[PDB]
Design a binder for this molecule. Structure first.
Ligand SMILES: Nc1ncnc2c1ncn2[C@@H]1O[C@H](COP(=O)(O)OP(=O)(O)NP(=O)(O)O)[C@@H](O)[C@H]1O
Ligand SMILES: Nc1ncnc2c1ncn2[C@@H]1O[C@H](COP(=O)(O)OP(=O)(O)NP(=O)(O)O)[C@@H](O)[C@H]1O
Ligand SMILES: [Mg+2]
Ligand SMILES: [Mg+2]
Ligand SMILES: [Zn+2]
Lengths: 295, 207, 734
């Protein structure tokens, strides 16, 4: 709910289920797994999970930051209300699909209908790599290369138990191939504009918009879908661990993506996606910070 | 205890660099092998995986039976040694504003080259895009002094440092048996960022 | 049922006297010529008495009877309320106004050259029907009127009646073919039968003949659709270091097309319908005409849930089919502008609403239930269940069935069993079969690919565009000439008709005053575009050394030798703009690649050129790179035929100038400041006085032709010359 953490990457790799592919933003169960894998190195994991199972804190997945915070595209909005000139409105829906991020200065101009030519930050490149003199040695890493002014900003409760972890993620990296150069950034904690923190609710039964990959608790998951307009994003992967000598997958969680609009806000949960017969839990953060649309 | 000391250096290219990228298109007159560049600023980069792999393939020549390369570079197997303690980084051409003061139009030269048949004696030309000489690139290399490895930090400093003399004495790039290497590190200082660790016992072992 | 059959055939074999009477010029009315001819071949009074009385104008009240349904469906399936002109072109009533073009009435074949319209077919063609009509009278001479051959007669019409008009004594309706007019009549008539048999009505003359405006404005049809989502990601899930080169891509984009075919088929026999009611099927999209009643809508919802359970069983939210249906009266008929497309879009809104709010409570709680200690995964699609070790890689159930289907892809016949090969539905799996193995295998429904003959299996006729001159790795090595001249590269082209949805929905709305915007025009337009991209691309890829990895809808993705890729696309567009009278621009991207390069690294760089040619203006070819981006009218005329032949003509009728001169011209064309105009003027004048006096006017007429476009100051003449010289160097490479 509190201050938002601008993070200037200039180089990243963000998943998308493979290594040939890369997102633009990094899906806040990744930043939670980064904080847990950083607090495990410090021996700070117990107090961090104690902080992490409270109503006090939040997390929120990344969004682009060009001189101001950006928001997801509200999925399902704008609803129709101008059904003419097929030649250009059929051409625009190929372009208005690839927008997916809006500034706060016009996010309520979007719910009323505006065209919003997609700005160009962070070309998602690709490079072929190798391992010399070996058998099959041509993997291809999709670089996310930010445009020298764009940052990512998780939104959280500013606590020093977490701010030490966030200051150490400056130097440990945050992304796909952290050891080979990707994902490492510089943090800058800034305050929130008054037209954003006014809308960051968590319990307002109203037309609302999720701002992380969330997963409702089953009493609220029934009619989270009766009005929700969402994606599912399939948060899978292998569970990282220093106690395997093997490679086991996580439990393949499906979560409502960011920008999923709702009515009647819900309550998320820390979904233990631990493998069967596995020593320590694998946590997979899904509890949402929301956003009021018409309030 | 926990710290993260970084090894800042200016790298220096005493011959060119050809770290290749993706092979786009021949385009008869254009460059056959273009150097990898930074796609926002169109500027020559060293990707950190090239530094990391070349340093690993030199130190692995020095240390054969290993156990010390695995903890400093990582290992997919052997649960102790995943994400092994070193986090390299791309190298971003710090003196863009200085090389044009030395008088130059681009930061990458195009070296023409050929291949001569042994019997037919007919040439086969090439244009290889190298980075120019004495481009100086940024460099940092996070070493994480975590809780467990406290007794063995200094025997992981005589290996990080010994892996830099090798890059000064091997080529660090592509096609480096024909020149195109000779990369010398300078101002190799080890500062500490996010930690409580004293590096006044290391910066004399570096210089 | 038991009498939905004869209503179907009598609303399909009616106006067949418009073939015999139109051929022999008989004075008897067409509602009697074929009606009395029908008794020669078989004895079925139920269909015959519909054909004797389908017009309901010779006998108003003589025949409960089912020709009332046939007459109202024949009015609705036309463009109006329905003598020596042939069938007009579809693109006469399309868009801007151009010449009036007319088809020559022919049959269809896989080896037949296309049937391009022309303005010189204004008189009526009568002698071309004797080959057509007797072609009707053979296979219809021994035919059975049931579900066994409910689908084989539809190809028998669409092979032969595809370029045959309907009721030439008219003013407007000409380009609706008889194989489409009869098809849409049989499509509506069964939906009227369902809408009338559900609502308990029995006598028809008081609701379908004298109460014309009662049913004419009663919301009594559904335009269904569906949208198999996630097709592109599933197909281009291939990456670098993949076991299958393009067989895992051919056999994967073919498999989803059989899935799109089978959703459309098996949806129509959960209802009581058949292939006439389907307006179109394509790349996962398939539009229908159904009945606006509750027993159909609940069948739609239950079948949608069934197929989504199937897709969740073995594709795990990568594929999602989303139905959607718009209720409409007889309002696809010239409140004229804002009635037709406004209800065709009502189904797309329901699709977009269901594509966005995918699942429900139980089917997502069952998803993330946990409970799996997986060590390995399918390294193609990252799935977990049913891992095998097919060629010592850990792959899944679907991605081993796709290698089995890639071994079976070359057959003509594809049958649906219950337990063999790739699953395509609930208790329904696909297997590729040889012809004489149909007695060995045991199936339920058989598809035959690229065939207009009726055959022996009595199958459903699909038409997937495919061609293979050789295997992929030879396409570089066959890039040479017989002399060895030619660079050893292979090209990949990806095409797309620009703005096809805009040319389909709006489409016909410019001519007239919204009077040509019917359902029949869009149905014939779908048949035209489907006919082209599923039949004629194999004609265009006949002699050439290529492979069509996909063709259909409006995409052509094709790998091959680069001479025979550039020639392929020049030929394809110069036939497509004759096919569409110059409407419907298409815009390709060709990319050159060396031998032995991976196919995703190849296809993605081709698709980037395709989208870099979408945004030139719209209509462009993007040769090999981001900069060589030419409008096709500025490419095929200027570069490929004018300049390239002038360059080849100069550089083969001499011996002094060689490739060094061409290379020095390519450099002066590529760098090009104002200084290189002077340096080029010096270079060519030096070489003018260095050539011998035999060939000096030959060189002067080349340098006054190269310096002329070099210094042209329009920028659309210098960029063309660089691509022309690149192609001439690529032609003569050793
Ligand atoms: N079987 C196939 N093989 C190859 N290409 C195909 C196939 N089916 C469809 N396509 C292509 O895919 C295009 C449509 O892509 P796509 O984006 O998946 O549309 P869609 O069905 O709406 N899926 P989505 O975009 O998620 O809604 C078509 O225009 C074709 O060019
Ligand atoms: N014969 C046809 N009749 C109707 N729709 C069709 C037909 N063939 C293909 N389509 C569909 O029309 C749509 C056009 O897709 P697409 O080509 O991506 O859009 P577009 O209109 O061409 N705009 P653009 O991609 O810029 O050219 C796809 O969903 C096809 O499946
Ligand atoms: Mg298109
Ligand atoms: Mg298309
Ligand atoms: Zn698979």
């Amino acid at each position: 709910t509190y201050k938002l953490y601008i993070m200037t990457f200039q180089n990243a790799h963000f998943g998308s289920g493979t290594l040939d592919s890369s997102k633009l933003t990094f899906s806040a169960d990744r930043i939670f797994s980064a904080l847990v894998l950083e607090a495990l190195k410090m021996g700070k994991l117990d107090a961090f999970l104690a902080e992490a199972n409270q109503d006090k804190f939040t997390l929120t997945d990344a969004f682009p930051f060009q001189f101001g915070p950006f928001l997801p595209k509200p999925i399902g909005y704008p609803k129709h209300d101008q059904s003419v000139d097929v030649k250009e409105v059929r051409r625009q829906a190929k372009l208005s699909k690839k927008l997916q991020f809006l500034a706060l200065e016009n996010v309520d101009d979007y719910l009323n209908g505006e065209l919003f030519e997609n700005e160009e930050h962070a070309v998602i490149d690709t490079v072929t790599k190798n391992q010399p003199h070996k058998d099959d040695n041509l993997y291809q890493v999709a670089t996310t290369r930010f445009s020298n002014d764009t940052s990512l900003y998780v939104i959280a409760n500013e606590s020093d138990l977490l701010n030490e972890l966030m200051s150490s993620l400056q130097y440990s990296g945050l992304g796909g191939k952290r050891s080979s150069g990707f994902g490492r950034f510089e943090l800058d904690i800034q305050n929130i504009p008054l037209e954003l923190s006014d809308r960051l609710t968590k319990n307002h039964s109203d037309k609302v918009m999720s701002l992380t990959t969330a997963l409702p608790v089953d009493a609220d998951l029934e009619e989270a879908m009766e009005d929700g307009h969402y994606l599912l994003t399939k948060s899978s992967g292998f569970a990282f661990s220093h106690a395997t000598n093997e490679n086991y997958r996580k439990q393949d969680l499906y979560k409502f993506a960011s920008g999923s609009t709702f009515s009647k806000t819900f309550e998320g949960q820390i979904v233990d996606v631990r493998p069967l017969d596995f020593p320590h839990a694998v946590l997979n953060y899904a509890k949402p910070l929301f956003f009021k649309l018409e309030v | 205890t926990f710290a993260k000391i970084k090894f800042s250096a200016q790298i220096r290219l005493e011959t060119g660099l050809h770290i290749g990228g993706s092979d786009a298109f021949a385009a008869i007159g254009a460059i056959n092998s273009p150097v990898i560049k930074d796609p926002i600023t169109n500027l020559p980069i060293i990707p950190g995986s090239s530094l990391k792999g070349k340093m690993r393939t030199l130190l692995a020549k020095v240390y054969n039976e290993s156990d010390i390369l695995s903890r400093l570079f990582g290992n997919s197997k052997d649960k102790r040694f995943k994400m092994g303690r070193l986090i390299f980084r791309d190298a971003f051409l710090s003196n863009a504003d200085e090389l044009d003061s030395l008088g130059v139009r681009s930061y990458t030269e195009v070296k023409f080259e050929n291949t001569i048949d042994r019997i037919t004696a007919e040439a086969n030309p090439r244009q290889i895009e190298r980075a120019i000489r004495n481009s100086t690139f940024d460099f940092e290399l996070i070493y994480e002094i975590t809780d467990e490895n406290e007794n063995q930090v200094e025997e992981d400093f005589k290996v990080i440092r010994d892996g830099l003399k090798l890059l000064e004495l091997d080529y660090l790039g592509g096609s480096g048996s024909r020149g195109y290497g000779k990369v010398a590190f300078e101002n190799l200082k080890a500062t500490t960022v996010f930690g409580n660790y004293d590096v006044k016992t290391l910066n004399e072992l570096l210089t | 049922k038991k009498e939905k059959i004869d209503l179907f055939y009598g609303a399909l074999l009616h106006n067949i006297g418009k073939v015999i009477q139109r051929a022999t010029g008989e004075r008897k009315k067409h509602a009697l010529v074929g009606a009395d001819w029908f008794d020669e071949i078989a004895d079925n009074q139920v269909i015959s008495d519909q054909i004797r009385y389908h017009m309901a104008n010779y006998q108003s009240d003589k025949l409960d009877h089912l020709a009332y349904i046939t007459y109202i469906a024949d009015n609705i399936a036309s463009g109006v309320d329905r003598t020596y002109t042939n069938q007009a072109d579809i693109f006469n009533v399309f868009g801007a106004q151009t010449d009036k073009r007319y088809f020559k009435p022919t049959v269809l074949n896989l080896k037949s050259k296309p049937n391009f319209a022309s303005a010189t077919y204004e008189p009526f063609s009568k002698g071309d029907y004797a080959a057509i009509a007797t072609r009707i009278k053979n296979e219809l001479a021994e035919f059975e009127f049931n579900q066994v051959q409910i689908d084989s007669l539809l190809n028998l019409f669409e092979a032969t009646l595809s370029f045959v008009p309907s009721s030439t004594n008219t003013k407007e309706i000409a380009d609706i073919s008889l194989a489409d007019h009869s098809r849409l009549t049989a499509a509506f008539a069964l939906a009227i039968y369902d809408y009338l048999e559900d609502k308990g009505r029995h006598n028809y003359k008081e609701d379908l003949f004298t109460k014309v405006s009662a049913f004419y404005e009663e919301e009594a049809f559904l335009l269904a659709s569906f949208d198999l989502s996630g097709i592109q990601d599933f197909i281009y899930n291939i990456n670098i270091a993949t076991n299958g080169a393009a067989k895992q891509l051919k056999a994967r984009s073919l498999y989803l097309d059989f899935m799109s075919e089978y959703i459309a088929d098996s949806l129509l026999d959960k209802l009581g319908l058949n292939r006439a009611n389907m307006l179109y099927v394509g790349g996962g999209h398939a539009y229908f005409v159904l009945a606006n009643t509750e027993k159909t809508v609940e069948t739609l919802v239950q079948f949608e849930k069934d197929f989504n359970q199937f897709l969740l069983a073995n594709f795990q939210t990568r594929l999602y089919v989303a139905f959607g249906w718009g209720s409409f009266a007889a309002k696809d008929i010239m409140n004229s502008p804002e009635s037709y497309r406004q209800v065709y879009q009502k189904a797309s809104r329901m699709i977009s609403k269901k594509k966005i709010s995918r699942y429900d409570y139980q089917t997502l709680m069952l998803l993330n239930r946990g409970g799996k200690s997986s060590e390995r995964e399918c390294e193609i699609c990252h799935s977990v269940e049913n891992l095998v070790s097919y060629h010592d890689q850990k792959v899944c159930d679907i991605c081993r069935g796709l290698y089995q289907f890639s071994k079976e892809i070359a057959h003509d016949h594809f049958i649906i069993t219950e337990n063999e090969g790739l699953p395509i539905g609930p208790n329904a799996c696909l297997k590729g079969v040889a012809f004489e193995k149909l007695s060995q295998e045991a199936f339920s429904r058989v598809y035959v690919k690229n065939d207009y003959k009726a055959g022996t299996v009595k199958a459903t006729h699909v038409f997937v565009g495919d061609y293979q001159c050789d295997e992929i790795y030879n396409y570089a090595a066959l890039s040479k000439n017989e002399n060895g001249l030619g660079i050893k590269r292979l090209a990949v082209v990806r095409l797309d008709v620009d703005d096809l949805g805009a040319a389909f929905m709006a489409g016909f709305s410019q001519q007239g005053n919204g009077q040509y915007s019917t359902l029949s025009r869009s149905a014939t337009f779908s048949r035209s575009m489907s006919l082209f991209f599923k039949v004629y691309i194999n004609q265009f890829a006949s002699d050439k050394k290529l492979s069509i990895i996909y063709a259909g809808g409006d995409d052509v993705f094709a790998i091959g030798s680069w001479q025979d890729i550039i020639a392929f696309t020049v030929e394809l567009r110069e036939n497509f703009i004759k096919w569409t009278n110059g409407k419907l621009t298409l815009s390709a991207g060709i990319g050159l690649f060396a031998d032995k390069t991976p196919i995703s690294l190849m296809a993605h760089q081709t698709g980037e050129l395709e989208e870099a040619a979408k945004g030139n203006e719209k209509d462009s070819i993007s040769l090999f790179s981001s900069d060589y981006t030419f409008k096709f009218d500025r490419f095929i005329t200027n570069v490929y035929d004018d300049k390239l032949e002038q360059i080849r003509y100069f550089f083969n009728h001499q011996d002094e100038r060689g490739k060094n001169f061409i290379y020095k011209l390519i450099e002066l064309l590529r760098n090009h400041d104002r200084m290189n105009m002077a340096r080029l003027a010096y270079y060519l004048t030096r070489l003018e006085e260095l050539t011998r006096e035999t060939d000096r006017d030959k060189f002067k007429t080349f340098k006054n032709l190269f310096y002329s476009w070099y210094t042209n100051k329009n920028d659309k003449d210098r960029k063309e010359a660089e691509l022309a010289l690149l192609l001439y160097i690529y032609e003569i490479r050793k």
